[PDB]
Nucleic acid binder design. Structure first.
Lengths: 48, 50, 88, 104, 52, 99
RNA sequence: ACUGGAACCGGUACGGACUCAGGGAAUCCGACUGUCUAAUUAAAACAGAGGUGACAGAUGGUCCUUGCGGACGUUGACUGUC
RNA sequence: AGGCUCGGCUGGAGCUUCCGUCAGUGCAGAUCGUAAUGGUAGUAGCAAAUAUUCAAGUUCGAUCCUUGAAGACUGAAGUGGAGAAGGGUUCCACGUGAACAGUAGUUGGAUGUGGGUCAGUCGAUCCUAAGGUACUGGCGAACGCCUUGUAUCAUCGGUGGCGGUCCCCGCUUGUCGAAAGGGAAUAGGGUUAAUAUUCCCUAACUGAGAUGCAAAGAUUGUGUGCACAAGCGCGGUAACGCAUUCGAACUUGGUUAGUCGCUCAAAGACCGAGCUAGAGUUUUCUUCUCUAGUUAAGGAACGGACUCCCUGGAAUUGGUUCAGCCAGAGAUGGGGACGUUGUUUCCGAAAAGCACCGCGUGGUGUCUCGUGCUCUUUGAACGGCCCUUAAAACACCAAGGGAGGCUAUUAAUUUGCACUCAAUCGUACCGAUAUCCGCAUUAGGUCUCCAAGGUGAACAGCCUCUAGUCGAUAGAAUAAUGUAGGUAAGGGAAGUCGGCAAACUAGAUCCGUAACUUCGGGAAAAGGAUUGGCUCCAGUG
RNA sequence: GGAAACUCUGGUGGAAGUCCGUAUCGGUUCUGACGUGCAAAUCGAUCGAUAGACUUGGGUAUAGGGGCGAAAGACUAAUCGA
RNA sequence: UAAAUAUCGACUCGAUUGCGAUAGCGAACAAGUACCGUGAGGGAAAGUUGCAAAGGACUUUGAAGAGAGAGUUCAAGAGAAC
């Protein structure tokens, strides 16, 4: 997930948490480094 | 149980997905006979003998 | 006391899910499936269980490869060739 | 008063689940788990406890400073001073008697 | 399960640098720190193992 | 708002304890456990032994008893010859006068 | 903190509620503690410690297994089973 | 007669005469099969677990949902707070009409739509136990079985040199099996409708790493900056202490092993005395009643029972515990050594939490003491018991050994800091008089942890505080019979198969206690007296 | 106290398949309740035991003419003289 | 060592003096399904509006179910469980 985030959005991650939801879907919480802004990256991606 | 196995969790997830009301637009298909989901399950009445 | 009182102690599963047949008939302590005989190499079937044979026999699943072979047999198992190159 | 609850999923009072009630800065009474305590070693010859050796769990012995596992003496940390004294005396006297017998 | 005490005895391996421990039922009067002599040339003493 | 807790005062208990210390509510009709359950004779004996041995240790340290008299009185105290500190002190004084 | 004692006071009464064996003389059976017919029998039944007897010195005894083999046995008569 | 024809109404697609021939060819029954429906009958019944009431909100609609006030209950071995197995979304929010919630329902564990489970440190993962299962080997007509054992067996891997290899050293063994055994390392505060040792903040720790920086190694003695010599550390009589001044194969060890009893200590809880801050009560009294006055992991410094060392030489024997027990095999005395539990006018850290007063984000305080046959937990040190003696592996550490290694301003080699990373899976909730098993929202069953005040011997019974409940279809009335409680004149087992049932007895202190006896008992034998409140006296440190 | 053997008195100590009794485990009597039940064995009171031959979770072993049995033909998933 | 022979289990076809939804395969249909048992295993019920959804717009009472009008239709007394 770390490498995929870096390669897809050109953003570095400081930590990745993962869980599997009751519907067997893997959900990841990726904390970006303080250099980047999560709101800006989300705006660029589209989900906002 | 809270401390379970991944395979059991997978089976439970599939059962959860299957336990769902039938889409309403299915009744408008040509030749349709299904009026509801006849395989719904209640956690307290019928138990998955896993 | 045999009955209502005794049924309250039933909370340890004798059988679990089998890897080969997916049934909840894998005996944990015996380490064998009471239905398909896993992990024996061979399958568990008995002629006195005619209905069980019917339930678990060929054709009750997908028979994906058998149907594929049947389809390919009709033309002699031809390989390495393509239809005549044509267009619309 | 204030009553506590286990913080792990082990609910049995086993040797691995020994607890101690502690008051936190937030005014709460909580459970703090006690690890197994180390034991002072014994002599190889006798069973008396050795001195100058810091007890610790076997895996935690690796973290101690060098001086806490040894004593500046032959067999230090393996034998008691009296055991070493007896060994030295026996070693000397038995060989002296062997020399006498060889002469004889 | 046994009514007679066992004696743990240590011998020296004759062919390699090692110690070999023997577990035998103790004869009455045997004590820790005692020396047991086993063989054809051992004397008649309590605890010695000798040919009959 | 967080309402105040319901009041549960110990005032009556404190007053009753003051009365008990003065000596009330302790007659025979107020006792439900045996004498040994209310005050173990083992605990009473432990207190007595510690008191007597401390007194003897103090005297020997202050050189008021030599080792021989100290030993004799120590064993007598263990043998239950002195009911209390006053008894022991009186006996010591008498024996020292005789000596 | 507990113990002993004395005056005075009241009232139907003072372990004031609460908690907690009625007692005794005999006969029969089983010594005792214990166990048991889950869902009609908790016993005088079974067990029991104690007693006696039998077999067995291992190339043995008593058992199981279709067979191979295995259990008592990490045992050896103060042992093992019956 | 079996049956048939026609009329009328319903219905919407097939039916039929006669001749042969064929048959799964005719029902009132079979405690017949199957489907449906009656009288019973608006009947039996919806009665265990103390209990609800007033005002208001919402709603078409309220005994039952929500708010407030009151009254009660569980009563810390709970109707409280969390877990293991099991369930599997029942968790949370917003809608809800029908069905279900044996009355109702605006409510719901129901129904519709969405949301929710975040870990290097908690577990699994890792080790092995009882035991399972393979190999070969034997057997077996065969699927396959039997043994887990010298039966079988040519089962390898370790240091060093060389750079695959040679020397030497030993001798062989699989693999599963525990979210209660063993085990690397995390704590506090805050945050969400629902996650929290996981997220945020702050502060730590463990393991695997190469690289970099700093300091060591890198001196001493003698003679006169130079010369010669000197290895791998020093102190203490000792128990041992201090620095980091190397070291392999191999060998031998350490790493609390039961249960019960008594003493002691620490922490938490509880209980007092004040001092603040806020509440409550004041016809009258009370310096009054209640609440808050907290300090994590990790560090530094101290402390530590037992045991050990030195001196010395003990009978007129001493020391000593509640109980033991210890001493010419070295006591007492005197002086020292060690160390787990733990403590702090110390860091963490008051910038937190808590209590209170303000404003539209501020301020103030968070302090001094005591006490104990008190409980829980931890620890120390001993005693009793056994024809009962209370795991194994992994891993780490230590010692003996001295193969080897670097060569006094070099080097080997440790030390400390600085950097990188720590995968995978579980994580919501219930855990039971409604989330489990019992056909169910069933008076049943189902493994554990925490545990306040009073009375009292007490985790007894009874009352109360924190927390939680008022959920058991409701109303009126109180006939007979009933179920469950409470009494009864005089008699006192006359009742009955039978004293069945009920009644009687009981706590504690003092006194007294028979036959018989296996001498231990019988025994609480039997049987008497006392018991409250208040004011004092005496004893026990 | 005694010539001795030894005896007596007061403490300490805390043994026992000891006793009363709570949690807990059982299930005696009422031949109580209920008996188309809360319940295909439950409910109330009264009772047996309560530091051991104790009570229990999980993991394991024993499988049908077999197992297991402190022995009732008991138990072996509401099924047991197969 | 081919042929003549066996056999519809598999794949592909043609028929019938057979049954016509309690019949015929257990299953004409989301049938080896729902559901039950720890397990081996057991195992259903369930066909039909109309030619065509044209599946009842709109008004009206009611919170709503629903009703009264109306409309579609050969016909709705064929109105969805038809």
């Amino acid at each position: 997930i770390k490498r995929a985030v870096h390669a897809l959005y050109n953003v570095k991650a400081v930590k990745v948490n993962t869980l599997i939801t009751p519907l067997q879907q893997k959900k990841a919480y990726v904390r970006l480094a303080s250099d980047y802004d999560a709101l800006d990256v989300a705006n660029k991606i589209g989900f906002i | 149980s809270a401390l379970k196995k991944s395979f059991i969790k997978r089976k439970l997830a599939k059962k959860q997905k299957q336990n769902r009301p039938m889409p309403q637009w299915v009744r408008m298909k040509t030749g349709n006979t299904m009026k509801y989901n006849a395989k719904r399950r209640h956690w307290r009445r019928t138990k998955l003998k896993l | 006391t045999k009955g209502t009182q005794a049924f309250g102690k039933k909370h340890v599963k004798s059988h679990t899910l089998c890897k080969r047949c997916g049934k909840s008939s894998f005996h944990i302590q015996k380490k064998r499936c009471a239905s398909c005989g896993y992990p024996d190499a061979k399958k568990r079937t008995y002629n006195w269980g005619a209905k069980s044979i019917r339930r678990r026999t060929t054709g009750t699943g997908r028979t994906r490869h058998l149907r594929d072979v049947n389809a390919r047999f009709r033309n002699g198992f031809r390989e390495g060739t393509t239809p005549k190159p044509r267009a619309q | 008063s204030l009553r506590v609850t286990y913080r792990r999923r082990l609910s049995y009072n086993t040797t691995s689940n020994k607890k101690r009630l502690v008051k936190t800065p937030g005014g709460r009474l909580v459970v703090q788990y006690i690890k197994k305590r180390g034991q002072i070693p014994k002599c190889r010859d006798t069973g008396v406890k050795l001195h100058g050796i810091t007890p610790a769990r076997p895996i935690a012995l690796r973290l101690l400073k060098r001086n806490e596992r040894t004593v500046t003496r032959a067999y230090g940390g393996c034998l008691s001073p009296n055991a070493v004294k007896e060994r030295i005396t026996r070693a000397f006297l038995v060989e002296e008697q062997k020399i006498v017998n060889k002469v004889i | 399960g046994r009514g007679a005490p066992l004696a743990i005895i240590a011998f020296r391996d004759p062919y390699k640098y090692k110690t070999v421990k023997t577990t035998v039922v103790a004869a009455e009067g045997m004590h820790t720190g005692q020396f047991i002599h086993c063989g054809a040339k051992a004397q008649i003493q309590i605890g010695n193992i000798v040919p009959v | 708002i967080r309402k105040p807790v319901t009041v549960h005062s110990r005032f009556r208990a404190r007053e009753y304890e003051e009365a008990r210390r003065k000596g009330r509510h302790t007659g025979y009709g107020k006792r439900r456990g045996t004498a040994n359950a209310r005050m173990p004779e083992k605990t009473l004996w432990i207190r007595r032994m510690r008191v007597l041995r401390n007194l003897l240790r103090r005297y020997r340290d202050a050189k008021k008893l030599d080792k021989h008299l100290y030993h004799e009185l120590y064993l007598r105290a263990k043998g239950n010859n002195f009911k209390n500190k006053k008894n022991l002190i009186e006996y010591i004084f008498k024996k020292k006068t005789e000596n």
